[PDB]
Write a protein that binds this ligand. Structure first.
Ligand SMILES: [Zn+2]
Ligand SMILES: [Zn+2]
Lengths: 107, 1523, 57
């Protein structure tokens, strides 16, 4: 994790996905002033294990892409540090059912 | 459709491709070469458009299949084009590949390694693997060929391995996986590829430049010559070629360039043109973009149109003949070209002859395909593209919608004597509408009579179909032949080829048949229900019961309705069990009733169920049989049971309420116990006298023991008697009760009538005295309010000169007049309320129940207490557009009133009533307010037509799957569970009505029979888990949502609600447990819990239910009720359009709701509001004095007289220091730039041009038509689709994607920073003024400085927080202390943590919320914002609908709108083609080589396949005994 | 009382099996010509709504 102050050089930004399997994540300290997952409208997002995903795709007989999507650059996706393929479990409070478990695939 | 004719073969999928020239030449029936269509005499010319080889024409037999005009299907022919032509639909694409390719090495100018990178990514995307396509970009080692070829090898190695690995598992098939997200990733790449392809100038493979290609509107390409820099580049790179061994360009040259390029770049184009893997292994050839031949459609689809006597030539034949003339001409030009040549040199002519030949045939080809691509001829003939998109298009006008057989139309007339589930069919329709009834042993008797009766005697038969397939019409036949055919109906089939079959009788529509009743617009599925046919003799109109009035939204004001007669038993069963009226008691919008009695019946019930209503044995029994007939199957006991009398001695008498008890006792099942309900009435106990309980509706064991029955009981009102009966006994019983009550009250209104008269409008002498006395105080009110707003002590006289001057100030200002109007209105309306409260009802001469005018308003039969008060007391203050009566420039509201009159009457306050009459002044004012409403109905462009049409086309496929999840047409998951609990809205009503369910325990326990279910379900698994989740939930009650335990997720997520008793929503669980704790009451608290658990189980949404259409209908239909204008933020349909239709990132009224802490006071919050609110220089300035003096130089002395320092510091939170910085840095720099610009503008244009013309300053009968004229046309028109967007929507769719030392140093520093100022003195001690001198040149002359300064002051900002204009403090919303911002900037509010709770900061802007807080937060904003639109208009829409809509908008992880843009990411090309731009979506489908899987409702309709929703969500198989 | 000149049941029609257009082979437009009643996109939407696939068919 690299917390930058104002801006990063376009040449320096190219060095971010240059060393796999190691991942580099950049964050502006002004954008980290308030935690987004603490907001009342942001439910509890939980990244699922390769086994938990495997089980979910079996119960509903789903294909990776056939699921609701979460962008790789989505604020919460960037917070948990989601990679393409990773499934996230969303426990959201409904004004009809209460606690409801939904899911999203990061592409 | 014939059931005797089954089909064994079916179309499973449609493949889009291009016809090859070689393919057309072989299938062609005849080559068309002749432009003439007919020979002399009248026979079709050989080689012409009417050739008999193309099919039978002019009573001649076809020369291909030999059949006549009837049986011949027609045959395709072909035109041989003498030169190849660009196919208009694919010209744009071939153009892209022409500009992207090198003219030397004949490769794309983009580097091969980069091209291979796209080919790799596109191959991996043929299979459903996006993650791998991105992982390819990670594969990395002016660069050597040996190194780059290794990169291509390593990339190809990963592609081959990733495909094989995913192929080994169930990740992708040999045919490849294809999803909308996969399609999104493909569409992105194919776009990026063409963008990179077009960008390259110099070829990356061989460094030589290619000449750029330009294009015009029509299909024609030119070649622009290279520049000297690029020509010298060709020379220096000319030697390396040897070692290896504007002008128009012809169609052949382009084809030849693309021929080599498509061969050399075949690898990438293989995946660029194939959506899924190319299993056919076909070569991607350039000649697919070119047309060497034209297919000639069969004569069958090119027949000449006959209108009366005149036989008009077919427009397609005309366009085809033109192609034929040009082809013969080029054949001659090529023949003359073939002759001669030794003599040449001037070859500029032979190319000029060639260019003309090519451009002429091309134009003729274009004119035939797409007319809007052909040259203007001195309206043109429509092309085949125009034929598919004439108006709404072939797909919308003739596929998605069609004119139908076995259907009728007529004006509807009311009828209370028919059942609520029936339709009164005129005998005219009954003798024409027939059903194909197959003759059998069980119905031979019934059909023999019908056959004898014939086509004019009902119940008869129009025709008889034999087992051989032939038809025998009974129309011309006499009783003798009909009698003979009837005795031949059940004869055994001699033919073994038809022994399986039996004869059919096309019998008249009987009283046992189903019909589909339709009243347009069909805004919701309740506007298309199934009715039971009741043929009524001597009728000329369709008769309909009053209970149906609501659902159809049909008023008997001369309305028209469509009757559809389905022709098979599967369609019958559906119209009787799914779309039938009785199953439509509750609307899915809110789960509330849309069925009930409307006017006479409500007034009849209040009288019949009244204590005063008594009946003798003779009277009582008559009322029972009058509405309940056992012969019509109204009874459940086969004998009319009767209660004993309520009065035994002296005379035997029955009460009115006892009739209601007896009706229920005979219509409800005997096996089930009576209904138990404690409801309320619209009529208060006070009206029925002292100590009455007649408001409390009491039903104990199916007996009305207390209270009368209103609109609140047997009307379309929730939790009434009919609804309570509907929940306990079902929909069939509730329907019987409605029809029974409907008859009873009709019969009761016949024996005991109901009237309204003058006696019901009169006040007593006592009551009228009160009226005059309260209205006597209203004279003072006018001047009192006028003296209050004007601010004058001791209440000055009405003729006061200072007051009259003060009222004038008010007259000239729109805001000041508003304050005066609102104050005077509130005061006179208080006098109105007093009159009404006193006089009604305690002052009315005739009183309830006898006062029918009063009775109708209280019962809810018709009218309200407001209408009653206007009739008997006063009309009140006539309000016009929120204010009072309009006033003239003279200060007079009418020529009768005094200028600036301080009287209530002058302002529009009407003391008069409609009973006594209204004065002429009051009459004119009432005319104003009366018309005002009708004017608003004329100026209302907002329509719900297009809004609903956009939702329905994108949600049609969305339904409930057998795995309880909400899945789209293509199997893609939208929701994991409907509303997170899987409950049907039409069931979720008494599910929380625990007291009701308890009072009816044994009745519901018998309803939800568990004895036949206990062996099929689990009784503990879910119940145990429910306790474990409740345990962890109670542990983290005070804890916040982010810190909450994630150990155990909800019981519904782990256990199937239809299989496990207890897998209930936590909302239901909490509500049920709370009831058992707060209410301790032979039913145990444990056995009741099981019943409610079982009720939830039986309230689940059925798999197959089209929740998509239902949702859009549930948002569309009630959004028609919000077409009216405002009485700041965007409301109604425009706000709903901002969300659903456009998903705007630029909202009209962006806001932020800031929750303030408890430690921050009301004064502190208001100071904070001032601190963020945008402050302008204009807001602090009182006066500006400019003293223009010309001496030596134009000297401008600008003095800024501000308000007092303490005044603006307490009103804007702005200091004197803050004012100094803005003037010294912003204002002077802005003023200097404005003066310089004004000097330039003066010297630029000296004056306007004289003599030269300047621009001007600024359906007819349809706009001149009144409502009765305009509605008379809509009355008969059978709608193609939903309303139309021709309003504001069309303009929204018009957007594409002596001084101190310190003061002297300050002045001197400012002089160095400004080019025109000389002096600068500012009030530093007091802070009241700012003076500065401006020096201009002698050439600058005259200038309007005051106007220049003024404009810059209101443009100068003192303090502004980015994107925020004003922060206000409204009244606490539902107890929550909040601040509403007129702008959006979260990061700025994040810094105000001491005042605002950063974890509760709400915002209406969805896109802004998505950008900062994520997709789930934006999703929650969509469901809340759409709810705000409906809640404001007091419309309740179930959150299950909104959640589905929001989930569909957020399906891609973004914010997609219901429009062409959002739709782009959808599998079905047929669904896309039937939405808009049919030929455009078709072109995209062909180029992708797409396979339409026929899984969307639209696609299935196109190919005639049964829809996969509801009854089509499964298959029916027959169990056969023999092996 | 006043009798208004309009006769509202002027658009009264019934069709079992009448004439059809050559191209679409669908009931032709025209009350007096024994024409068909149009089942438009909204009625299609309503028939999808009930989940009544055979009524749509
Ligand atoms: Zn033929
Ligand atoms: Zn090249």
């Amino acid at each position: 994790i690299f917390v930058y102050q104002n801006n990063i050089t376009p040449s320096a930004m190219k060095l971010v996905p240059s060393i796999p399997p190691a991942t580099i994540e950049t964050f502006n300290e002004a954008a980290l002033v308030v935690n987004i997952t603490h907001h009342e409208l942001v439910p509890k997002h939980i990244r699922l294990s390769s086994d938990e995903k495997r089980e979910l795709l079996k119960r509903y007989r789903l294909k990776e892409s056939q699921l609701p999507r979460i962008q790789r650059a989505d604020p919460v996706a960037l917070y948990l540090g989601l990679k393409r393929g990773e499934v996230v479990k969303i426990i959201r409070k409904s004004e009809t059912s209460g606690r409801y478990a939904s899911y999203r695939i990061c592409m | 459709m014939d059931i005797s004719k089954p089909v064994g073969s079916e179309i499973t999928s449609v493949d889009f491709g291009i016809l090859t020239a070689k393919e057309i030449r072989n299938l062609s029936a005849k080559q068309i070469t002749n432009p003439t269509v007919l020979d002399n005499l009248g026979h079709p010319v050989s080689g012409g458009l009417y050739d008999l080889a193309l099919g039978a024409f002019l009573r001649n037999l076809c020369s291909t299949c030999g059949l006549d005009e009837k049986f011949c299907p027609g045959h395709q022919g072909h035109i041989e084009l003498p030169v190849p032509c660009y196919n208009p639909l694919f010209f744009n694409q071939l153009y892209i590949y022409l500009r992207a390719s090198c003219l030397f090495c004949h490769h794309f100018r983009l580097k091969s390694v980069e091209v291979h990178r796209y080919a790799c990514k596109l191959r991996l995307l043929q299979y459903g693997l996006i993650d791998e396509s991105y992982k390819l970009d990670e594969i990395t080692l002016d660069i050597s060929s040996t190194l780059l070829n290794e990169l291509k090898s390593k990339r190809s190695e990963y592609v081959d391995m990733a495909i094989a690995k995913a192929l080994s598992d169930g990740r992708t098939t040999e045919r490849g996986s294809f999803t909308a997200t996969v399609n999104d990733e493909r569409k992105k790449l194919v776009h990026e590829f063409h963008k990179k392809l077009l960008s390259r100038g110099k070829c990356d493979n061989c460094g030589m430049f290619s000449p750029k290609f330009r294009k015009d509107g029509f299909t024609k390409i030119f070649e622009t010559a290279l520049n000297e820099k690029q020509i010298t580049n060709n020379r220096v790179k000319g030697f390396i070629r040897q070692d290896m061994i504007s002008t128009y360009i012809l169609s052949t040259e382009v084809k030849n360039i693309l021929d080599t390029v498509f061969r050399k770049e075949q690898c990438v184009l293989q995946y660029v043109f194939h959506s899924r893997p190319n299993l056919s292994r076909k070569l991607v050839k350039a000649d697919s973009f070119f047309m060497d031949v034209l297919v000639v459609p069969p004569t069958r689809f090119r027949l000449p149109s006959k209108l009366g006597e005149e036989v008009h030539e077919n427009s397609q034949n005309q366009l085809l003949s033109k192609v034929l003339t040009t082809s013969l001409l080029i054949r001659d030009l090529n023949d003359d070209l073939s002759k001669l040549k030794v003599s040449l040199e001037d070859r500029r002519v032979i190319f000029s002859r060639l260019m003309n030949a090519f451009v002429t045939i091309q134009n003729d080809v274009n004119a035939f395909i797409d007319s809007t691509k052909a040259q203007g001829r001195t309206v043109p003939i429509p092309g085949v593209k125009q034929a598919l998109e004439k108006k709404e298009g072939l797909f919308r006008k003739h596929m998605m919608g069609k004119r139908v057989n076995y259907a009728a139309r007529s004006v509807i007339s009311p009828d209370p004597n028919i059942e609520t589930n029936e339709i009164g069919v005129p005998p005219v329709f009954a003798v024409k509408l027939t059903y194909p009834e197959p003759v059998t042993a069980y119905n031979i008797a019934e059909l023999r009579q019908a056959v004898i009766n014939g086509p004019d005697k009902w119940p008869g038969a129009t025709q008889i179909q034999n087992e051989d397939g032939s038809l025998v019409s009974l129309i011309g036949m006499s009783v003798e032949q009909r009698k003979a055919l009837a005795n031949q109906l059940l004869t055994p089939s001699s033919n073994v080829s038809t022994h399986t079959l039996n004869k059919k009788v096309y019998r008249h529509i009987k009283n046992r048949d189903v019909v589909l009743m339709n009243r347009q617009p069909t805004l919701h599925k309740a506007s298309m229900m199934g009715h039971k046919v009741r043929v009524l003799p001597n009728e000329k109109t369709l008769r309909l019961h009053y209970a149906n009035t609501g659902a159809y939204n049909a008023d008997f004001d001369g309305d028209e309705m469509n009757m559809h007669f389905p022709q098979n038993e599967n369609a019958r069963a559906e119209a009787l069990n799914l779309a039938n009226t009785d199953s439509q008691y509750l609307t899915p919008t809110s789960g509330s009733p849309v069925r009930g009695l409307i006017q006479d019946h409500i007034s009849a019930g209040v009288w019949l169920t009244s204590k005063d209503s008594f009946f003798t044995r003779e009277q009582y029994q008559q009322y029972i049989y009058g509405c309940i007939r056992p012969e019509d199957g109204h009874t459940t006991r086969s004998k009319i049971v009767t209660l004993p009398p309520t009065i035994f001695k002296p005379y035997p008498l029955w009460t009115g309420k006892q009739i209601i008890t007896t009706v229920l006792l005979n219509v409800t099942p005997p096996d089930m116990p009576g209904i138990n309900l404690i409801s309320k009435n619209k009529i208060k106990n006070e009206y029925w006298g002292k100590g009455s309980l007649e408001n409390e509706v009491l039903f104990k064991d199916g007996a009305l023991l207390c209270g009368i029955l209103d609109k609140s009981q047997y009307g379309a009102s929730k939790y009434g008697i009919v609804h309570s009966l509907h929940e306990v006994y079902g929909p069939e019983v509730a329907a019987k009760v409605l029809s029974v009550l409907g008859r009873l009250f009709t019969n009761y209104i016949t024996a005991t009538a109901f009237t309204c008269g003058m006696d019901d409008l009169r006040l007593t002498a006592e009551g009228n005295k009160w009226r005059t006395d309260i209205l006597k105080t209203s004279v003072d009110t006018g001047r009192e309010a006028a003296a209050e707003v004007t601010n004058l002590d001791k209440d000055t006289p009405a003729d006061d000169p200072e007051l009259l001057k003060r009222l004038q100030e008010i007259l000239r200002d729109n805001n000041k007049s508003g304050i005066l109007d609102a104050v005077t209105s509130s005061k006179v309306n208080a006098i109105t309320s007093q009159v009404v409260s006193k006089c009604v009802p305690d002052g009315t001469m005739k009183k309830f129940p006898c006062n029918s005018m009063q009775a109708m308003a209280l019962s809810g039969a018709k009218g309200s207490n407001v209408n009653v008060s206007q009739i008997m007391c006063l009309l009140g203050q006539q309000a016009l557009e929120g204010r009072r009566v309009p006033v003239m420039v003279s200060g007079k509201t009418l020529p009768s009133f005094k200028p600036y009159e301080t009287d209530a009457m002058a302002g529009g306050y009407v003391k008069g009533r409609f009973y006594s009459g209204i004065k002429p002044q009051e009459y004119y004012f009432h005319c104003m307010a009366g018309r005002e409403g009708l004017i608003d109905t004329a100026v209302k462009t907002s329509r719900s037509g297009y809004l609903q049409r956009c939702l329905t086309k994108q949600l049609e496929g969305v339904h409930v799957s057998y795995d309880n999840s909400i899945r789209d047409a293509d199997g893609t998951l939208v929701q994991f569970m409907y509303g997170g609990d899987a409950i049907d809205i039409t069931k979720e009503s008494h599910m929380t009505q625990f007291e009701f369910c308890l009072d009816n325990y044994y009745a519901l326990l018998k309803k939800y029979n568990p004895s036949a279910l206990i062996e099929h379900l689990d009784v503990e698994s879910a119940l145990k888990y429910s306790k474990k989740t409740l345990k962890y939930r109670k542990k983290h009650s005070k804890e916040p949502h982010y810190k909450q335990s994630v150990k155990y997720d909800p019981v519904l997520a782990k256990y199937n609600p239809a299989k496990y008793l207890g897998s209930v929503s936590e909302n239901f669980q909490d509500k049920l447990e709370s009831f058992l704790d707060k209410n301790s009451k032979g039913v145990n608290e444990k056995k009741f819990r099981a019943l409610m658990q079982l009720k939830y189980m039986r309230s689940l949404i059925n798999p197959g239910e089209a929740v998509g259409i239902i949702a859009s209908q549930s948002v569309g239909e009630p959004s028609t009720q919000m077409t009216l204008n405002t009485f700041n933020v965007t409301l109604g349909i425009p706000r709903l359009r901002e969300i659903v239709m456009t998903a705007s990132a630029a909202i009209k009224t962006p806001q932020m709701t800031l929750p303030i802490w408890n430690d921050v006071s009301d004064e502190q919050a208001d100071t904070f509001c001032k601190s963020i609110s945008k402050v302008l220089l204009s807001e602090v300035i009182d006066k500006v004095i400019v003293t223009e003096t010309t001496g030596t130089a134009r000297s401008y002395v600008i003095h800024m007289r501000f308000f007092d320092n303490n005044e603006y510091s307490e009103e804007y939170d702005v200091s004197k220091e803050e004012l100094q910085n803005v003037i010294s840095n912003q204002f002077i720099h802005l003023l200097e730039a404005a003066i310089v610009k004004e000097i330039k503008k003066q010297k630029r244009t000296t004056g306007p041009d004289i003599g030269v013309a300047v621009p001007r300053l600024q359906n007819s009968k349809r706009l001149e038509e009144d409502n009765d004229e305009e509605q008379s046309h809509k009355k008969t028109k059978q709608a193609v689709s939903y309303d139309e967007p021709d309003e504001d929507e069309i303009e929204t769719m018009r957007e594409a994607e002596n001084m101190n030392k310190v003061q002297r140093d300050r002045q001197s520093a400012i002089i160095s920073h400004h080019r025109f100022i000389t002096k600068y003195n500012f009030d530093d001690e007091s802070g009241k003024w700012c003076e500065f001198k401006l020096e201009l040149a002698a050439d600058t002359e005259k200038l309007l400085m005051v106007n220049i300064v003024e404009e810059i002051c209101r443009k100068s900002i003192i303090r502004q927080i980015p994107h925020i204009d004003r922060c206000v403090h409204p009244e606490p919303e539902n107890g929550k202390r909040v601040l509403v911002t007129e702008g959006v900037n979260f990061q700025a509010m994040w810094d105000q943590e001491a005042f605002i709770d950063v974890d509760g900061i709400t915002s209406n802007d969805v896109a802004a919320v998505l950008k900062t807080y994520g997709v789930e937060a934006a999703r929650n904003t969509i469901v809340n914002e759409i709810n705000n639109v409906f809640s404001r208009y007091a419309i309740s829409v179930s959150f299950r609908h909104l959640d589905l809509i929001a989930d569909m908008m957020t399906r891609q992880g973004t914010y997609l709108a219901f429009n062409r843009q959002g739709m782009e990411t959808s599998t079905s090309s047929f669904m896309k083609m039937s939405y808009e731009t049919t030929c455009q979506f078709l072109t995209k489908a062909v180029l992708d080589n797409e396979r339409e899987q026929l899984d969307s409702p639209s696609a299935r309709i196109v190919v005639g396949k049964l829809n996969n929703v509801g009854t089509g969500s499964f298959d029916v198989l027959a169990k056969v005994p023999n092996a | 009382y006043q009798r208004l000149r309009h006769m509202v049941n002027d658009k009264f029609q019934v069709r079992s099996t009448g004439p059809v257009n050559s191209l679409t082979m669908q009931p032709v437009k025209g009350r007096k010509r024994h024409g068909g009643i149009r089942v438009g996109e909204m009625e299609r939407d309503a028939l999808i709504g009930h989940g009544t696939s055979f009524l749509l068919q």
